[PDB]
Amino acid sequence: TLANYYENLVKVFFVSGDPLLHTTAWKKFYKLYSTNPRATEEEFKTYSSTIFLSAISTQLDEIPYDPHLRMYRLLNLDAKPTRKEMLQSIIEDESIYGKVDEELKELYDIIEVNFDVDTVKQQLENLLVKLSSKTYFSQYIAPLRDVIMRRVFVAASQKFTTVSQSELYKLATLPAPLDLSAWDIEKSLLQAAVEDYVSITIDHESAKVTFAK
Numbered sequence: 456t457l458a459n460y461y462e463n464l465v466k467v468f469f470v471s472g473d474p475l476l477h478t479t480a481w482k483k484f485y486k487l488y489s490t491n492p493r494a495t496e497e498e499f500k501t502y503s504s505t506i507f508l509s510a511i512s513t514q515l516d517e518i519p520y521d522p523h524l525r526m527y528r529l530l531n532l533d534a535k536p537t538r539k540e541m542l543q544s545i546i547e548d549e550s551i552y553g554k555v556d557e558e559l560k561e562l563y564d565i566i567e568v569n570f571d572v573d574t575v576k577q578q579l580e581n582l583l584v585k586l587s588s589k590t591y592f593s594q595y596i597a598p599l600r601d602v603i604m605r606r607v608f609v610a611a612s613q614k615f616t617t618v619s620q621s622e623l624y625k626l627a628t629l630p631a632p633l634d635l636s637a638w639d640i641e642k643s644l645l646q647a648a649v650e651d652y653v654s655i656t657i658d659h660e661s662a663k664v665t666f667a668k
Contacts, residue, residue, distance in 0.1 A: 478509040503554035512599035583631035600633035
């Protein structure tokens, strides 16, 4: 079966940390499932919502040889996939996007098209309560929380020079199950630092953070 081989591929790519190949293999499985006539409409909604959520919660494109080449080949990509393009390919594919739960579309709008650090918590607040009722949701909690805080941090890198950790972390503390403690928030920030999305200065005795250039 080509289905099981793709299924297996989505698992592999999920544990590898190559999320773009994960949602890609998902799409390759979905086309198959759509050809198939054992189609329940609910599997469609679950799979489509799963796929789209995978794309939303995908890490922002680091700009980096390429060791994904045989995987690109295996999956019939001809170039390195892009987060923005994956999301776009899903949005413009009505076979998928017509089955996507509207909570994920609301979510997409909030973090991709109308992001504001000064409004995110209030907007995400009850939405995440709804999303926490979804069965496809829990396993993307970690990468989704990671991408929004990343959004929060670069937006912060441009708003602040020197700011208290209290105001910074309170600002980066997302609602509902995307909540992280202060030490995790400081680590997530140090992570964004080493990925060169940000240049900082951290555990100053003054309990402050200093965003650089």
